């Protein structure tokens, strides 16, 4: 199991990988590839060495102070729990942190639409926002630098 950014070559496939939530699977199967190709987002996939068991999406954003946003993260039902989800979060943090070393980014936001995801991101250290930002959790670039010493 390795994590890699989506390859712009055609015929990539990797059809179905149920994560439990129909919306995330639908986004993976009908939005992710085109939005990566059209530079709307940067899509990263976790799959085996034969060619998918997970994915996440990154997107530059502003809070203006520039940052990066993790909008979607999904893990197949055969990989139950938070483990490889947290590993994918660490991979995304490393990507955002190299990007901050390059062009300057002060933090990473993350979208949490349900309470299970809210608790998941809260167990990883993300700070809960309130009000109109109740579904958004934040983690600074300084903490990501601390993570990789």
């Amino acid at each position: 199991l390795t994590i890699e950014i989506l390859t712009d070559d055609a015929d990539y496939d990797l059809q179905r990988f149920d994560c439990g939530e129909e919306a995330l699977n639908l986004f993976l199967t009908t939005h992710l590839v085109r939005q990566h190709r059209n530079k709307i987002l940067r899509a990263y996939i976790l799959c085996r060495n034969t060619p998918v068991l997970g994915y996440y999406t990154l997107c530059g954003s502003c809070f203006n102070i520039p940052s990066v946003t993790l909008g979607r993260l999904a893990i197949d039902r055969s990989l139950q729990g938070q483990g490889w989800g947290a590993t994918l979060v660490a991979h995304a943090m490393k990507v955002v942190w190299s990007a901050s070393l390059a062009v300057g980014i002060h933090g990473l936001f993350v979208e949490a639409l349900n309470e299970k995801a809210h608790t998941f991101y809260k167990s990883l250290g993300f700070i809960p926002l309130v009000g109109e930002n109740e579904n958004a959790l934040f983690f600074p670039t300084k903490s990501i630098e601390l993570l990789f010493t």
Binding site: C59, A86, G107, L124, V130, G131, E132, P140, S143, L146
Partner: protein
């Protein structure tokens, strides 16, 4: 300038669109295409976060000033990352 959009709609829909366009001092061309590409940005870019809130903005600024130490789960995940 070079492309075009063709659609069909109800005379009720057209009456409403034309009335509001006239209220906006606009043709249905500019009203439709504005109200389209102005609302379409709201969809194709969720690249902005208006944290403005007395508690939320202060939480973000306290995170920027005082950065929380990486938790146990994040350290274990970083250990699981190398491979």
């Amino acid at each position: 300038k070079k492309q075009r959009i063709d659609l069909r709609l109800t005379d009720d829909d057209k009456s409403m669109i034309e009335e509001a366009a006239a209220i906006s001092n606009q043709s249905v061309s500019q009203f439709m295409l504005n109200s389209a590409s102005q609302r379409a940005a709201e969809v194709i870019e969720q690249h902005r976060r208006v944290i403005l809130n007395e508690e939320s903005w202060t939480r973000v600024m306290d995170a920027l000033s005082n950065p929380p130490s990486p938790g146990e789960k994040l350290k274990r995940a970083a250990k699981r990352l190398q491979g």
